[PDB]
Assembly symmetry: C4
Homo-oligomer: 185 residues x 4
């Protein structure tokens, strides 16, 4: 588990195996089964993002992985809060492909963008450019950069190419609450 | 020791084993026993932070680990001066849990925040937001973000979740003197 | 391939072997032969840099490596879009030595600088200093910093020494489209 | 050599072993003996820092290591131009201890500060704070932060403690030409 987590994160880790083991011992005192349900997971985001409405967001993050074990729980927290976005592109594809069918549709992008938008304070909201100030505008822009028609599908190959190649695209799909905020101020 | 330090720091290290070995040879010329007392440790902070009152701070850092050996001494200096705060969350919990009982109480947070505040120059002080300009205000805000009642306790699980998840929380518990300063100017 | 890529990038990687393997499976669904032609490669840049004219640029990048296999394709995308420029100096020499003869001539630098310039929007263009606002001015400045006469040749030794030693030089040869942009605003 | 360099730099490297090997092949075409003299080394700095007077600086850097072999040459270029200063503290001590006797005297600090100052353009010079605008002022401030009397000696232990602990000190001893410049603008 600790080496397994460290193995999956590799460059994104903010912990050593010993520290992961300490966190783990603590986690087990709280969740003796070593599993956390979707409801328990959503509560972490509700408790730590008082100003926003993190429910949809936390559910989508949970979904990207019944329950999550400690490994997935630790990775989820790293994906939403630590590291650079360009190091999480594979995972991000999993977040955007809402139904897990392997391709991202326009409706899926809208779904994720809407949930991310709910993480932003209505205050930070008016600091947004006119062309990206609503879920639908932000989602359309994204679809547009990928050169997609409403009917089209986006594969993992194109998704990684575009997000890596063009930083403008990376900035639009960005899902970490803090980074979405710190790109305006 | 050098591999042992390098092993504990892992990603936070600013030295190679050879350089650690050089520093060590130098350290032994000064402290032949290879041990440094609390009083000797406090003197390093007093000597290098002339403008502040580092005593309480240095004592708490020392405590987080009679004497410290070279390994702990090197780690302590890394914890207070190098790397990114999000990579020191496990250690930070040890710093905040003043009595080492495993949970952080409101009084402990106040204790650490007060010591950190003593590291800031009275000059940089008035550059602080109204809601975080005194030890008690800064400590209350922290307790408030964790959703705690004065009577409550904070576990290591919640501490890591909150500090990692919400950067606002990370900024409030930040203990490195330089970062506390460079977040205002 | 995944370990082979990870081996060549080493510090520049934004992916783990597992993620590279996922991207690969996706790539094969699109290109069953596991090879991508110059024309297919150019299309990625045309599709993701709508505002510029990426043809010459994409051709030079392709050339630095008939077809490219997945490994070279992944590295090419990393070279143009991720990491710090100072970590790509060896590769950059390969990009500038247009004919692959081992030395860079003044005409080669002009060729690459012109292609890079085509990646910049005519809008960002007037934000350029007077002495670097045209391909020929930018190329001359570069040649001048290297202390070269129009007739001279630049070896890989001098190229690495100059670009590493003097950041001014590094900034002038910079080839990543985003960095060229973000150095003005 | 390539693994040996990679071993000494470890975290500071901007090259892979293969790239170091390429640079090496190029270096040998220029210096078949694989050795570079002090005069040859100084010429690199003179050629790439046209606006300054890099002689004293290049000599001190050379000295910190007759001739230098490729390994030392590569490390020297990394020390002066790449990475973060806090990762080069052991080496920096070697740079400041001009006579190699193991302790730094006030005259040695003045010597190095003067050489570094010669790397700054007279233009960037007036952008310097009043208390650090001359070699003697900058050197005195440094000695003062270390709490030293003119007669005193500075050991490697204290040097590392102070430079790591107090970023103000790190900024004053900073020796990379670019960083000295980019700390004003
Ligand atoms: Ca889907
Ligand atoms: Ca306690
Ligand atoms: Ca050529
Ligand atoms: Ca000396």
């Amino acid at each position: 588990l600790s080496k397994e987590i460290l193995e999956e994160l590799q460059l994104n880790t903010k912990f050593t195996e010993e520290e992961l083991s300490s966190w783990y011992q603590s986690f087990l005192k709280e969740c003796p089964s070593g599993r956390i349900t979707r409801q328990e997971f959503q509560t972490i985001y509700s408790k730590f993002f008082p100003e926003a409405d993190p429910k949809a967001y936390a559910q989508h993050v949970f979904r990207s992985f019944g329950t999550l074990d400690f490994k997935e729980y630790v990775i989820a927290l790293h994906m939403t809060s630590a590291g650079k976005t360009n190091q999480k592109l594979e995972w991000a594809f999993s977040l955007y492909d809402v139904d897990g069918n392997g391709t991202i549709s326009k409706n899926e992008v809208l779904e994720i963008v809407t949930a991310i938008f709910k993480m932003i304070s209505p205050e930070d909201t008016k600091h947004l450019p006119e062309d990206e100030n609503t879920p639908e505008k932000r989602a359309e822009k994204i679809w547009g950069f990928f050169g997609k028609k409403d009917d089209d599908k986006l594969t993992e190959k194109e998704f990684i190419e575009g997000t890596l190649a063009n930083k403008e695209i990376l900035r639009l799909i960005q899902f970490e609450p803090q980074k979405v905020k710190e790109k305006l101020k």
